[PDB]
Design a protein around this ligand. Structure first.
Ligand SMILES: CC(CO)(CO)NC(=O)Nc1ccccc1
Ligand code: NI
Length: 341
């Protein structure tokens, strides 16, 4: 049974609701982005209209084999009519192809669904500036003040300098980067670029990256592992055992691994500055956890909401516990009283 927070009232629309069978009343299914918790339930046998971005549509077609007749891609920043309702898709600053959705209801209500997002001040000058928003369906992943992390720019600078230093000291070191979904591509692309290498990866991952409309991509990635000194592996393999095993496979070309695990937030954010981050080391293998987030920090979230001044907020993350729900509602009220709406 589809939960209430995935239905858009006064419409036949649902958001990220593919795991409930046929939803009674739903005439169009929106998908905000291609992450598994959100697409869960889609496959080649799905026979209802799906509305999404061009990039999400590319992945639906090539990775899940959804038939082309049921895929409805929409351009961003453009007023579109779907089943008699005006909608707009906006960039969510999450992973590639991720969108927020503005719904203009027939009765005059305006609803914004953020999907998954990392709030940014640049959103204050999108088509959101034009009009009032009555209800906000909010990505509340990190809705608590202990959740702090640096900018994406600062984290990339750290990773570039770290990788460049290690490989300039030892030209026989290999760099490995972990992945388990789309998003955070800048980590491995920035490192390969400073080292003058293409990024090497499996055929399955190369296929996924070929759907993302990244400029000049054929210049940046490859399935020829032997030609590359930056390798991608599954996140599960980024450990001392998995990396030792991978080093064996490279045929004595390398004598050292430097590896990166981009995580979200970790409790080591509560003590240590990004400049001060150190690896875990065992012999000739070092592993860095870096706090590269594609969700809003607490402060970024607060700023966005206080700018938008919604009349009602519906959380879409951390909704399963009463303690979480009570915590989030307290912050929403604090933000409202501070700003004065
Ligand atoms: C009605 C409900 C549950 O309390 C639905 O999630 N939440 C809100 O709308 N609370 C809210 C508080 C301050 C500012 C704006 C909204
Ligand atoms: Ni996501």
């Amino acid at each position: 049974t589809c939960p209430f927070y995935k239905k858009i009232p006064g419409t036949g629309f649902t958001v990220d609701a593919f795991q409930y069978g046929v939803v009674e009343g739903c005439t169009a299914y929106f998908l905000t982005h291609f992450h598994s918790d959100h697409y869960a339930g889609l496959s080649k046998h799905f026979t209802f209209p799906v509305y999404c971005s061009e990039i999400t549509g590319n992945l639906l077609k090539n990775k899940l084999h959804v038939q082309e007749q049921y895929i409805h891609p929409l351009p961003l920043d453009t007023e579109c009519i779907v089943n008699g309702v005006k909608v707009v898709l906006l960039d969510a600053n999450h992973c590639p192809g991720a969108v927020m959705i503005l719904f203009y209801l027939p009765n005059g209500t305006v609803i914004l669904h953020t999907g998954d997002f990392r709030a940014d001040p640049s959103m204050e000058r999108s088509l959101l500036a034009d009009q009032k928003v009555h209800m906000l369906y909010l990505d509340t992943t990190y809705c608590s003040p202990e959740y702090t992390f640096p900018s994406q720019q600062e984290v990339i600078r750290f990773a570039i300098n770290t990788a460049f230093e290690a490989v300039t000291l030892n030209p026989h070191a290999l760099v490995v980067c972990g992945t388990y979904s789309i998003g955070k591509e800048k980590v491995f692309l920035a490192i390969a670029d400073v080292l003058g290498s293409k990024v090497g990866m499996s055929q399955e991952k190369y296929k996924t990256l070929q759907c993302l409309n990244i400029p000049e991509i054929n210049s940046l990635i490859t399935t020829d592992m032997c030609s590359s000194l930056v390798h991608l592996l599954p996140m599960m393999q980024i450990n001392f055992k998995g990396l030792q095993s991978h080093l064996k496979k490279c045929g004595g070309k390398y004598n050292q691994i430097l590896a990166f695990r981009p995580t979200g937030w970790t409790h080591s954010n509560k003590f240590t500055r990004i400049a001060d981050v150190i690896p875990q080391t065992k012999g000739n293998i070092s592993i860095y956890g870096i706090p590269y987030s594609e969700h809003s920090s607490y402060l970024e979230m607060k700023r966005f909401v206080q700018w938008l001044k919604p009349q009602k907020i519906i959380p879409t993350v951390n909704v399963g516990t009463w303690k979480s729900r009570s915590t989030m509602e307290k912050y929403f009220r604090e933000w409202k009283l501070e700003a004065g709406y």
